[PDB]
Design a protein around this ligand. Structure first.
Ligand SMILES: N[C@H](CO)Cc1ccc(O)cc1
Ligand SMILES: N[C@H](CO)Cc1ccc(O)cc1
Lengths: 403, 406
């Protein structure tokens, strides 16, 4: 239900660079399923939101009728299964739209004479042009010669599967272009290079990555993902919405205009819900948001709505939602049907030596709960949210559930 | 009949650099034949004296009981199988003039035998042994990269191919010209990575050509081929630039330093004769002797004492070839001087400046004092044509070339 022009317009959204764009248009006009290539290194099995940027663009190609070929760069079986298992949360898996390949399948048989021919397609000066190599070579940092061979292995993969398009982050620009040169050498139409921007991590400056521990895994439990999303740096909200969701620009502005907290809740709800599912919907947009049960015009104030898995994750967040004031976590086993005796609470926090003493202080108006003078010695409190306990004029302790 | 120390001393003669020299001595004490490697380019089958420098050092290794493994670099060469094989035969045939050929001391191999099958995985492990900065240190690469001259990336794979060849045949020593230094050293690093003792790198100087400036090579036409006719070889050796004599004696013969210094003290020509005789004879044989020294010189029937002058002795070809080896004014005659393409011989000599008048020319002819093209003139009225340049001669030292306009 899309013309070639319409398909291109959709694919361009969020794209960093498509080279050459006019070639993609021509291929989309052919009326056949294009082969979209993505290679992944087995040493990084677990996926995080950063990987979702490129993968969701591939899901879009699939929904448009195109075929994805996921190449595991084993050149293992365990990580492959982990990566493949998680990739399915975003990519469709039917044979007509998805194929799994291991490059050892054809690379292991590549001969020395073939390698000589491949490397002859580039000059030393060209290779040292690649950004990473250039910084290293000028900094006196060693570059093992075998490293210059890898772009040719990745390029040969494009020849092996006759790739029409190859996906990648902006850091993969050089390798994808080598793919075009190698395909030409083998008499194939050179692949369209499709680059997506890199998602910045939770620290707010560096690329999201396992090695930097600034990520959010696709398979982390809902409560943990929701919590992390609620804590993304405000400056990153704009890029997270553009790269992780399909919300329109005006919808994103409206959310921001509503404020930081509302924007975080909508982002946390959208993504926690999407990734809690076996597979994400083809569009993480306003319609999806309302299909969950939330109201767009409520701008995050309707926390009781939504599916139970997301609702509970948000409730867990509100229980611990956060410096001189001492913090103490209360064991869940201390609660009786969601509530706990205020006397016991003051004793556990160390403000009173026993419940009897707590009752005495209450009778003397010496204790406060959330800044309110306690008067009911038998009062029972819930920990749906952190509570500040106070004894006298200068003793404060903030208590909350599970740490 | 040599101790390890004696062996090393002989092998050191003429060498430009042996590294590590202590390792060669160590291997020479192991009481086993060492594998001495030489790689050859199948696109350069014709051999000249320049190749003899490294090949004769290898012959010395053979005479000491060591084994030569000659490797034809057909892998890179074919990157047709017909010419490869033909050239290999050409190279081997000519190399046999210097190298012993029996199995115990010689083995021929083609590196395609093992390189064709090297897997991409093995190539990756191989190239991980050196950095980009390291590679760019090789003579040519460095100059080219700094200047901006293109270097195809595949060129950086060749040193590893040559290095793997040393691993393939477990080389104890690899021979080469001074220009092959970088490649031989990579071979050591690769052998180390493959659990082998690193090969000793044996470098020889590069023989300079007949021009006296550039290295001897086919593409420069300043070479002397090993299979050239004894006559053609003797003549070229007599023409070796004087400054090169010492290096020719040291790199092509085994004459002692004193013998050489004594030969030079005798003069250029004398020195050239001994050299031309020694090499002309040696290379006219089906295979050269183990030592091209005084003993060989005398076994030819020459006297070390007559220093070159002993010119009438020695073998036939040599003595003869040496014999075969052992500015004339021009005057144009205007067509006006001719009559139906002919002129009076008397006037010709006068116009040439060999006689003051035609009358004198006539008297000289009568006294047999004049020659025409080497023949004694006997007719004073002789009519001569200039169908081609003629050589006029008076007495034994007065010559003149006469011809028409041109
Ligand atoms: N260039 C990256 C290597 O790990 C990703 C990759 C891309 C394509 C491939 O065929 C293989 C790997
Ligand atoms: N170094 C020259 C070309 O690479 C010749 C050569 C030397 C050693 C070999 O195993 C092969 C070729």
């Amino acid at each position: 239900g899309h013309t070639p022009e319409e398909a291109l317009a959709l694919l361009k959204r969020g794209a960093e660079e498509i080279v050459p764009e006019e070639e993609l248009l021509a291929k989309l006009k052919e009326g056949r399923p294009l082969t979209v290539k993505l290679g992944a290194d087995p040493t990084r099995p677990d996926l995080h939101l950063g990987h979702a940027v490129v993968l969701r663009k591939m899901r879009q190609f699939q929904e448009l009728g195109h075929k994805v070929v996921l190449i595991i760069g084993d050149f293992t079986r365990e990580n492959a299964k982990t990566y493949v298992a998680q990739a399915g949360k975003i990519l469709r898996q039917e044979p007509h739209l998805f194929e799994l390949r291991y490059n050892s399948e054809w690379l292991e048989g590549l001969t020395f004479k073939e390698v000589v021919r491949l490397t002859s397609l580039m000059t030393v000066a060209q290779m040292l042009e690649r950004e990473d190599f250039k910084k290293r070579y000028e900094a006196g940092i060693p570059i093992s010669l075998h490293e210059l061979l890898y772009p040719f292995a990745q390029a040969y993969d494009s020849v092996a599967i006759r790739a029409d398009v190859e996906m990648g982050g902006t850091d993969q620009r050089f390798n994808l272009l080598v793919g075009r040169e190698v395909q030409r050498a083998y008499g194939q139409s050179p692949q369209v290079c499709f680059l997506m921007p890199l998602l910045v991590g939770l620290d707010g400056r560096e690329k999201m990555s396992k090695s930097l521990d600034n990520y959010i895994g696709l398979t982390e439990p809902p409560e943990a993902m929701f919590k992390k999303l609620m804590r993304v740096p405000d400056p990153l909200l704009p890029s997270y919405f553009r790269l992780l969701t399909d919300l329109e620009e005006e919808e994103i502005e409206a959310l921001l205009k509503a404020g930081p907290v509302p924007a975080h809740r909508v982002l946390a709800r959208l993504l926690t819900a999407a990734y809690a599912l076996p597979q994400i919907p083809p569009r993480i947009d306003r319609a999806f948001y309302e299909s969950l049960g939330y109201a767009w015009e409520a701008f995050g104030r309707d926390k009781e709505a939504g599916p139970e898995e997301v609702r509970r994750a948000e409730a867990r967040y509100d229980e611990v939602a956060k410096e001189e004031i001492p913090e103490v976590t209360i064991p869940a086993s201390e609660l009786k049907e969601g509530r706990i005796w205020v006397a016991r609470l003051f004793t556990l926090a160390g403000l009173t030596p026993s419940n009897a003493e707590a009752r005495r202080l209450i009778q003397n108006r010496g204790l406060r709960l959330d800044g309110e003078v306690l008067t009911d010695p038998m009062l029972q409190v819930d920990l749906s949210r952190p509570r500040i306990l106070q004894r006298g004029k200068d003793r404060f302790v903030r208590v909350r559930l599970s740490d």
